[PDB]
Ligand binder design. Structure first.
Ligand SMILES: *[C@@H]1O[C@H](CO)[C@@H](O[C@@H]2O[C@H](CO)[C@@H](O)[C@H](O)[C@H]2NC(C)=O)[C@H](O)[C@H]1NC(C)=O
Ligand SMILES: *[C@@H]1O[C@H](CO)[C@@H](O[C@@H]2O[C@H](CO)[C@@H](O)[C@H](O)[C@H]2NC(C)=O)[C@H](O)[C@H]1NC(C)=O
Ligand SMILES: *[C@@H]1O[C@H](CO)[C@@H](O[C@@H]2O[C@H](CO)[C@@H](O)[C@H](O)[C@H]2NC(C)=O)[C@H](O)[C@H]1NC(C)=O
Ligand SMILES: *[C@@H]1O[C@H](CO)[C@@H](O[C@@H]2O[C@H](CO)[C@@H](O)[C@H](O)[C@H]2NC(C)=O)[C@H](O)[C@H]1NC(C)=O
Ligand SMILES: *[C@@H]1O[C@H](CO)[C@@H](O[C@@H]2O[C@H](CO)[C@@H](O)[C@H](O)[C@H]2NC(C)=O)[C@H](O)[C@H]1NC(C)=O
Ligand SMILES: *[C@@H]1O[C@H](CO)[C@@H](O[C@@H]2O[C@H](CO)[C@@H](O)[C@H](O)[C@H]2NC(C)=O)[C@H](O)[C@H]1NC(C)=O
Ligand SMILES: *[C@@H]1O[C@H](CO)[C@@H](O[C@@H]2O[C@H](CO)[C@@H](O)[C@H](O)[C@H]2NC(C)=O)[C@H](O)[C@H]1NC(C)=O
Ligand SMILES: *[C@@H]1O[C@H](CO)[C@@H](O[C@@H]2O[C@H](CO)[C@@H](O)[C@H](O)[C@H]2NC(C)=O)[C@H](O)[C@H]1NC(C)=O
Ligand SMILES: *[C@@H]1O[C@H](CO)[C@@H](O[C@@H]2O[C@H](CO)[C@@H](O)[C@H](O)[C@H]2NC(C)=O)[C@H](O)[C@H]1NC(C)=O
Ligand SMILES: *[C@@H]1O[C@H](CO)[C@@H](O)[C@H](O)[C@H]1NC(C)=O
Ligand SMILES: *[C@@H]1O[C@H](CO)[C@@H](O)[C@H](O)[C@H]1NC(C)=O
Ligand SMILES: *[C@@H]1O[C@H](CO)[C@@H](O)[C@H](O)[C@H]1NC(C)=O
Lengths: 50, 220, 198, 85, 149
């Protein structure tokens, strides 16, 4: 699963079988690191109109 | 079932009989009208392609579709602000009520702004605000909710203290039981009827305003 | 910037035409945007594919142009219905509707032709130079309550008069401009003053 | 601002009419470029009391303009000629 | 494959913008209606029936709402109506008398003149009536005295 984002610490406690996390809009906003079993939130990289 | 339009009311018509009202009800009714939408803006290039440069290179073959979509959304976004400007900003003078609320028995506390609330909203307006719950951006409206509440407060102060005179020129002060008598004469009822029964009309008006607040608080 | 509403419509229509002309320069994924180049370079089995790509791109552009043209036609039709309503109610008559025919009390209106538009000159009456007076709802005289037929009781400090509501014109409170209903015990704020009888 | 970050405009504490809309009550104007919270209107406290009225003693005959669009340019597009020539 | 995704997403975006333009036209029509109600019901008293509430419109109060406006229409509704016997004109001294502003009513034995929207009986005098023609023309004219002050 590839993408671009800011990976921050997450307060979402996954169940042990779950790896990624999705919101209402079917975008990956939570993920589990495979090396160390910790949960990371994926904020999209900052963008805006100029 | 087959539905029924209404109850049958055979009017007692004859060629020499009339029905004359002997009393009246001061009735307050609500009318809700939408004014603007959420101003949405879409980055067309980021929505179609994201950060892929090959996708944008292929998207440049289709020309100025993204420019047309952005310009249409910009036109909608400025049209919402124009709609709010035409609806609420009909006065250029910000009126205030006097500190003493002596209006001949008429109570406007449910529609005047509450000084205890930081949002400076009326209790009815506060209830109304409580009852409403990838390249995408939401532009904020040009007028904030505090300034729209300020515009409605100015309109209420003008129509309470000055009648319809502030909408046609300078605000000319007039007592409210006189303003009401003028309105009574506008619908073809004599001033004396208003003056003699002013306590009953004020009580009916306050009861109807309270029933409006109760009906808004009790209907989802 | 006085005539910006007509110029906005003219600029939108000219910009839509310019966009529709500009969309012919796009190849929409084909090898070229020129049909003669494709027809002179390729055999019909692959020129059919290239012409098909050009056809679907230009057809999408034309359908889009017709879609916003119909939306703008609906908007202009609504504006023209409003303009016809203003022509009927402000020019051909005097309107009681507030701010429909200008700011103030509407007197009359003049129509003027404009390029793709109409300009209404609304002649209105604005009150000015207002003055304070002490007012009362009714006049108590001979145990009877007197109310103005069309005006309002005013006082300049010592004397009571009745005047029309939109212009200060004080007149003596008589039985000809007042009517009698009830006694003085009911009306709140009734004051004592004489009522002249002609 | 609540609309975003504005760079190159000097924020002032005075309130004027909106010249260039920024959003969330912020507007920009040229006088250098300044940014400010808009002022809705001049304040005006009506001298209300229960027995005083204001009566006009004069009038102004005011003529105002109202511009309303009526029609557009009648454009026709030959669909076959536009797509194919 | 990217060209297929581009044309699908572009068709989706064109559909969204088209329906947003249609909804923007509808919201603009509703906002023009709301501005008309703001001008005619709040800033003045409107004679238009059912434009500013059900009943005879007295006044209106504006209230802000999230993306909207709420008008509180204060109106006058007649109530407790009563039957009366009515006539178009009063015949007196060979003259036909018509009400200046009200209407002739009778409770069974006596004739009065009252305003149309509220029962307030008054003695039929020469101050609230006017004279036009004789009694031979008006159909349904009745005989009653007309007091002269
Ligand atoms: C005025 O008189 C008419 C006729 O007497 C009344 O109409 C009657 O009302 C009763 C009660 O609802 C009905 O049962 C009759 O069928 C009605 N008759 C007709 C011919 O319609 C009317 O109610 C009276 N109005 C008032 C205010 O008393
Ligand atoms: C007109 O209707 C009002 C009600 O809207 C009447 O007021 C009521 O009068 C009764 C008895 O006089 C009281 O018990 C109620 O409390 C009153 N209600 C209110 C809201 O004040 C009034 O009496 C009626 N007048 C006529 C002439 O019928
Ligand atoms: C105007 O109406 C308000 C609200 O109906 C009145 O405020 C109420 O006052 C009573 C006693 O003074 C309290 O028990 C209620 O809790 C108050 N309600 C609210 C919502 O504050 C007020 O008294 C009325 N009169 C005036 C002159 O303001
Ligand atoms: C209010 O208006 C009346 C009417 O003009 C004033 O009464 C007149 O005042 C002048 C000035 O002294 C006298 O010459 C007249 O004889 C007065 N007329 C009558 C019928 O008495 C009155 O003075 C005004 N009051 C104020 C306070 O301005
Ligand atoms: C207006 O005139 C009435 C009638 O003269 C006054 O009412 C009288 O007031 C006195 C003392 O207040 C009483 O002794 C009388 O019995 C009252 N008569 C009636 C018929 O009510 C009234 O006070 C006057 N008001 C003003 C402000 O001058
Ligand atoms: C009518 O009288 C009121 C009160 O006497 C006047 O209101 C005052 O006007 C001055 C002049 O600008 C202000 O400084 C005060 O703050 C006002 N007081 C209030 C309570 O608003 C009013 O100007 C008078 N009207 C006219 C036309 O002279
Ligand atoms: C009402 O306002 C008008 C202004 O439109 C006044 O007319 C002016 O009066 C002054 C002095 O009398 C003259 O110098 C001006 O030339 C007049 N202007 C015009 C356009 O004629 C008028 O005097 C005012 N009337 C009152 C009673 O205040
Ligand atoms: C119609 O109304 C008139 C006036 O209110 C009534 O006439 C009065 O009736 C009472 C009751 O008998 C008498 O005490 C009065 O002396 C009468 N006044 C006059 C001037 O004669 C009349 O009775 C009413 N008729 C009906 C059928 O109700
Ligand atoms: C109303 O009054 C007129 C005039 O007094 C009455 O008309 C008279 O009626 C009698 C009887 O029918 C005739 O003999 C007279 O010649 C009539 N006079 C005129 C001038 O026409 C009329 O009948 C009365 N109507 C009612 C219902 O009482
Ligand atoms: C991977 O190795 C790290 C450190 O050696 C260890 O903490 C982690 O639990 C290991 N993950 C798995 C799935 O064994
Ligand atoms: C107006 O208010 C004063 C007190 O400010 C009071 O004495 C007077 O009775 C009031 N008049 C009316 C008609 O309410
Ligand atoms: C009214 O109708 C009655 C019969 O129902 C009739 O006798 C009378 O002449 C009529 N009056 C008028 C003015 O039509």
């Amino acid at each position: 699963l590839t993408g671009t984002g800011v990976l921050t610490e997450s307060n979402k406690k996954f169940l042990p079988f779950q790896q990624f996390g999705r919101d209402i809009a079917d975008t990956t906003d939570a993920v589990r690191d495979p090396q160390t079993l910790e949960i990371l939130d994926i904020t999209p990289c900052s963008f805006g109109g100029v | 079932y087959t539905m029924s339009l209404g109850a049958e009311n055979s009017v007692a018509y004859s060629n020499n009989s009339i029905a004359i009202p002997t009393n009246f009800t001061i009735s307050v009714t609500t009318e809700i009208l939408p004014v603007s939408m959420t101003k949405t803006s879409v980055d067309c290039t980021m929505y179609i392609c994201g950060d892929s440069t090959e996708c944008s290179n292929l998207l440049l073959q289709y020309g100025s579709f993204c420019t047309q979509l952005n310009r249409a959304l910009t036109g909608i976004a400025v049209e919402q602000d124009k709609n709010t400007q035409e609806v609420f900003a009909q006065v250029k003078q910000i009126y205030k009520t006097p500190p003493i609320k002596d209006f001949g028995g008429f109570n406007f506390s449910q529609i005047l702004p509450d000084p205890s609330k930081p949002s400076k909203r009326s209790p009815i307006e506060d209830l109304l605000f409580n009852k409403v719950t990838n390249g995408l951006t939401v532009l904020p409206p040009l007028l904030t909710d505090e300034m729209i509440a300020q515009y409605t407060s100015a309109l209420l102060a003008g129509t309470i203290t000055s009648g319809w005179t502030f909408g046609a020129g300078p605000a000319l002060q007039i007592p409210f039981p006189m303003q009401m008598a003028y309105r009574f004469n506008g619908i073809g009822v004599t001033q004396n009827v208003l003056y003699e029964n002013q306590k009953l009309i004020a009580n009916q008006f306050n009861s109807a305003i309270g029933k409006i607040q109760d009906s808004l608080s009790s209907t989802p | 910037s006085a005539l910006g509403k007509l110029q906005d419509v003219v600029n939108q229509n000219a910009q839509a035409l310019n966009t529709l002309v500009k969309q012919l320069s796009s190849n929409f994924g084909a090898i070229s945007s020129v049909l003669n180049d494709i027809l002179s370079r390729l055999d019909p089995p692959e020129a059919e594919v290239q012409i098909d790509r050009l056809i679907t791109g230009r057809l999408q552009s034309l359908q889009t142009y017709v879609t916003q043209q119909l939306i703008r036609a609906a908007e202009i039709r609504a504006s023209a219905n409003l303009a016809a309503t203003k022509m009927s109610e402000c020019v051909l008559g005097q309107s009681k509707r507030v701010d429909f025919c200008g700011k103030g009390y509407h007197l009359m209106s003049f129509p003027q032709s404009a390029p793709h538009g109409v300009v209404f000159l609304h002649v209105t009456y604005v009150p000015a130079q207002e003055k304070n007076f002490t007012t009362a709802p009714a006049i108590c005289h001979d145990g009877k309550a007197h109310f103005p037929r069309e005006g309002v009781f005013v006082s300049n400090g010592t004397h009571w008069f009745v005047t029309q509501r939109n212009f200060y014109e004080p007149q003596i409170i008589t039985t000809d401009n007042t009517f009698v209903s009830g006694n003085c015990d009911v009306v709140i704020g009734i004051v004592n003053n004489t009522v002249y009888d002609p | 601002t609540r609309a975003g970050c504005l760079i190159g405009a000097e924020h002032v504490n005075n309130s004027y009419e909106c010249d260039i809309p920024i959003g969330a009550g912020i507007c920009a104007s040229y006088q250098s470029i300044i940014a400010y919270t808009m002022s809705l209107g001049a304040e005006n406290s009506v001298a209300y009391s229960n027995n005083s009225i204001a009566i006009p003693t004069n009038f102004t005959i005011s003529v105002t303009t109202e511009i309303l669009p009526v029609s557009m340019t009648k454009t026709s597009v030959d669909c076959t000629m536009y797509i194919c020539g």
